From a paper:
P. gingivalis displays two forms of fimbriae on its surface, FimA and Mfa1, both of which are crucial for attachment to other bacteria in the oral biofilm and to the host cells. The resulting mature protein thereby has an empty position in the first β-sheet that a β-strand donated from another fimbrial protein presumably fills in order to polymerize the individual proteins into a polymeric fimbria.
In order to investigate the importance of the C-terminus in terms of folding and solubility an additional construct was designed and crystallized, pMfa1Δ9, where instead the N-terminal extension was present but the final nine residues at the C-terminus were removed. pMfa1Δ9 folds into two domains, the N- and C-domain which together form an elongated structure of approximate dimensions 100 × 45 × 40 Å. In pMfa1Δ9 the β1-strand is anchored by the side chains of Met37, Met39, Leu41 and Met43. Further, in Mfa1 the N-terminal part of the β1-strand is shielded by a short helix that forms a lid over the sheet. In Mfa1, the β1β2 loop - where the Rgp cleavage site is located - is flexible and has not been modelled. In Mfa1, Trp554 is inserted into a hydrophobic cavity between the N- and C-terminal domains. Mfa1, the shaft protein, possesses an extended C-terminus that, in the crystal structure of the mature protein, partly reaches into the void formed by the missing β1-strand. This C-terminal region, however, had to be removed in order to obtain a precursor form of Mfa1 in which the N-terminal extension is intact.
Residue numbers in the entry: 32 to 43, 70 to 554
The structure:
Amino acid sequence: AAKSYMSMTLSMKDKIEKVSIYMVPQGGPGLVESAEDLDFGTYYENPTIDPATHNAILKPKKGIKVNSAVGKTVKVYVVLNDIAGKAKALLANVNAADFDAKFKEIIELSTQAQALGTVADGPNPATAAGKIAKKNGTTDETIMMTCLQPSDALTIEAAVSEANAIAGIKNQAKVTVERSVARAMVSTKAQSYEIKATTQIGEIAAGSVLATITDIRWVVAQGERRQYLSKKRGTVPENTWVTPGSGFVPTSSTFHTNATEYYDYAGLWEDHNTNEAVISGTQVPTLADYQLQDVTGELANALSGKFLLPNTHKSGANAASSDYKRGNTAYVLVRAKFTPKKEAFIDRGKTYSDNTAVPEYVAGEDFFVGENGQFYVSMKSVTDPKVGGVAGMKAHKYVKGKVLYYAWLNPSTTSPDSWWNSPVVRNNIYHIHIKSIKKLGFNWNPLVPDPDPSNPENPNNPDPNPDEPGTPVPTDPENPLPDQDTFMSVEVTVLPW
Ligand SMILES: [Ca+2]
């Protein structure tokens, strides 16, 4: 039953499962006519490429029935792969007059509670972005897409045959769609790195090998948990496209109480391992692993990277004028095993004040790095002057040698201590390549909200504070992005997806 037919040419490996079309009459209050959750393979041909734009076109092969909208001037909006039902639910019973504004309103992918995981959620936590972006084995990917702007207006003519609509003779419009998530990818020059001392460390002279970093893994966190259904422009040059959390600029205290109102951390538990002797997270491929034809299984999942929801703030040229902070910006967390040479330990071969012998450092065990930069086998050593310790000195405990590094997804400018800004925008790929790991990282991750910040326990953080009270924190959520002295050498590439 149809007063007329219409169709939609769509423009952009991606699998398109579903298509939703919304015909919005112009001019004032009115009735939207929608055809939601159509089976893509029933209504469209397979994607093909155009020489000019070198982009994909999705050509209709079946007509869309029109009834209420016949004779009206409409604009057409499109959602592809609405697989969490979010667009359908947001747009239901929306008047034609309100539809354009509603199409740029917010959808919630993870609740505030869901934005934090625990150990029981690993190794495959539900993430905000994962709910609208799925990898189908190693074959292809199903990703939600929306149009940035609707079709040019057109008048739906009555009595147009399905054949003429499909052929584009009458009642055909054109829409461009873009993916609702961004992709993070990480690679590494080598799977191991040699660390040189830059000063005397125990018996290790400056310039000599201090340690080896092995078993490098990664996770991604602090993308958003909500998003504008389709991209929303800001009002100033410093932030082209705004996100629901753009206005949030944390302080040391408001980070813990308010960060989950905007950001997802469930992904920190991806590929988590409950054995603390083992490094948690996803493997990092070498550049060589991409050239490999026919990969295994868990290497395949690592190569294709991870999804996250957009996250932008007002950009600036310094700490004062940039609203990007460590507590509101998307980050890659790199985890690795740091194995120091036993000779690096200033307490080696010495005797404690209680006349017991200082034990030799055992590879893979905890070690402690004092405020003075020296290495100790225990807290007893750290504070005992007879073994090179210092009374009242604090130290960082590296739990079974676990070290942590941050990489920001879209550093600008580059390269070391001037990347003040890091916008993450949908339908882009952020490729972080590790060229080297240059020194000792951090022993825990303070960029995770702690529901009771007065104590070090935090079940929502796989890398909680292991240190005694009064120990300086490695970093703070209210800090700006750039590192005064780089822990990692990286090159970040951003390209259209
Ligand atoms: Ca706590």
